[PDB]
Structure formats: C-alpha cells, structure tokens
Design a protein around this ligand. Structure first.
Ligand SMILES: C[C@@H]1O[C@@H](Oc2c(-c3ccc(O)c(O)c3)oc3cc(O)cc(O)c3c2=O)[C@H](O)[C@H](O)[C@H]1O
Ligand SMILES: [Mg+2]
Length: 286
C-alpha cells in the first residue's frame, strides 16, 4: 500500500539535496505520471539531465553494493534519493515515453521467440548490475520497464509495496530457496528469479504459488515443478537448469556466470553484440 524504494549506493556516493538541481520542465508521462526534468548543478555529473519524481508517501531504504559509471543500454539508474519535508525525491535516468513491462504482459501472449528477446536483454542488464555489486533478491516484473522503442530497461533500484517493519521485504513468489530461508545467498539467487520471470512470461502464471506466503515458501523449498509440456525442449532445459534448488548447481552460478546462460541452446539465435548495440528490434512496440 506504500511504496518502498531501495537505493543501492556506490562507495564514493555524494549525498544530494533539492538545492543541487535546476528545474527545466514538468512532464506528464503516462504510467510514470508527473515527471520533473532537472539539471544537476554540481559534482561529477554537473550539467547532466535527469528525471525527478517527488513521492508524498514513500519509504527509502539505502543499501551498500558488494571507475566513473557509464550508461548501460538496458538499465535505468537511481542516481540520488533524499527525503525533505515528508517527501521523497528520486533522481533517475530520464526515460521519455517509457512504460511498464507489466502493462505489456497483460496485453500480449508471449511466444518463445518473443521471450528470447526480452530475456536476452534482461540477462545483459542483470549481469551488469551484478558486476556493479547489486544483488536483486526479488527481481520481478515491477522492476522491468520499456523505453519508447520497446527495449528492456531494468531498474537498478528496488521498488515494492509495503505491524513491524523489515529491512528487506520481498515478493516471495520470485525468491530463490536460499533467499526464502535467509541462510545466505549470492548473485546466483537472481538467476532463479530470472527463471521465474521466464516461466511467467511463457505461461502467464507463476511456477510456485500457494494460498498464503507460508505455503508459497514451503513450495519454493520442496515443491516439484510441473514443467508445461507445450514448451520446447530448449525452454524446458533452461528452466530446469535455472530452478536447481542447490545454488551451486544452478545455471549462471559458475565462474563464467551469465555466459552459462548466453551459451544455452535456448538463446542460440541471439547475436549478443548486435543486441547490446540495440540493433535487434523488440517483438512489441509500446
Ligand atoms: C517511483 C515511481 O515513479 C514513477 O514511475 C517511474 C518509474 C517506475 C519504475 C518501476 C515501476 O514498477 C513503476 O511502476 C514505475 O521508473 C522510472 C524510471 C526512470 O529512469 C525515470 C522515471 O521518471 C521513472 C518513473 O517515473 C511512477 O509515478 C510510479 O508511481 C512511482 O512508484
Ligand atoms: Mg542521495
């Protein structure tokens, strides 16, 4: 019922305040609502243009991550997040004409061909965040945006809808077993969530889902997955390899990380260089 934003800050982070920004424009951006276009006044990113959101009733959680940063084609970043007079200010990559991946998934039926495109961009994005020291934990469709051209933009910040408060409050359906049991986890937990995203894109349903959180948790830990037989052998194989309960056995967990996924037969048709250059067209345009 309330928005919680999670900001994964870098080591050299420079705290910001309202005074460090010049207001340029006020835009109405559909799903994004009222967006201020602002210009950074000082610091290393002086003169950079950003989107600013001002949230009336939101909580902010700031976390540490595990070179000057450059843009990645498939990520939007939260640059600054600060609270002033009961308000939360978010300074974000400007994403004009952007929209929600969830809006798309509700409107379309994804085929395996469609999903290969979206998951390939998402894999590049997720691996990049890992290289930056960000572990997602409960990567989910709410984290996935689309630019005006229809390409994936994964948010580098957490966003959820949140009795006692918790430092981490994730959506259980997307959580790996080792995350559910709070025994310790790594970037490999995110490849499980990646598999959950893939499963949901392909079937319109979640692979582990009970009546309550408690039941869903037990299913994630112990439930055998009923693999939909309409899926190709390649799709089936990828999902089985992502849904290994022991993270050590999970695809993407070895030293080569995301390469294990890029080399999987499910993605055999993807040219990863062309993809990164944004030279492959999306299945759906917003
Ligand atoms: C923090 C979010 O800001 C606004 O949406 C934006 C989002 C966003 C992200 C995840 C979601 O699940 C979602 O529903 C929206 O992301 C943005 C990213 C940017 O780089 C720039 C933006 O202006 C927004 C941007 O304006 C919306 O007002 C949304 O209600 C609010 O929760
Ligand atoms: Mg800040």
């Amino acid at each position: 019922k309330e928005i919680a934003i999670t900001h994964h800050v870098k080591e050299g982070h420079e705290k910001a305040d309202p005074s460090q920004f010049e207001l340029l424009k006020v835009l109405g951006q559909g799903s994004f609502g009222k967006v201020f276009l602002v210009k950074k006044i000082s610091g290393s990113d002086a003169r950079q243009l950003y989107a600013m959101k001002v949230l009336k009733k939101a909580t902010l959680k700031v976390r540490d991550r595990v070179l000057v940063e450059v843009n990645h084609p498939f990520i939007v970043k939260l640059h600054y997040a600060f609270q002033t007079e009961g308000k939360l200010y978010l300074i974000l990559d400007f994403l004009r004409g952007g929209d929600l991946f969830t809006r798309l998934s509700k409107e379309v039926m994804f085929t395996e061909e469609d999903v290969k495109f979206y998951l390939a961009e998402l894999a590049l994005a997720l691996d990049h965040l890992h290289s930056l020291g960000i572990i997602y934990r409960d990567l989910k469709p709410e984290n996935i945006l689309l630019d005006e051209e229809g390409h994936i933009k994964l948010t580098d910040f957490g966003l959820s809808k949140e009795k006692k408060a918790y430092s981490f409050c994730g959506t259980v359906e997307y959580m790996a077993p080792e995350v559910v049991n709070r025994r310790g986890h790594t970037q490999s937990a995110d490849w499980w969530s990646f598999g959950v995203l893939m499963f949901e894109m392909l079937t319109g349903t979640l692979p582990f889902q009970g009546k309550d959180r408690k039941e869903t948790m037990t299913m994630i830990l112990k439930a055998k997955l009923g693999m939909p037989q309409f899926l190709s052998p390649e799709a089936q194989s990828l999902l089985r390899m992502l849904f290994k309960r022991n993270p050590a056995n999970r695809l993407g967990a070895g030293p080569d990380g995301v390469e294990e996924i890029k080399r999987h037969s499910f993605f055999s048709t993807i040219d990863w260089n062309k993809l990164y250059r944004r030279e492959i067209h999306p299945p759906f345009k917003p």
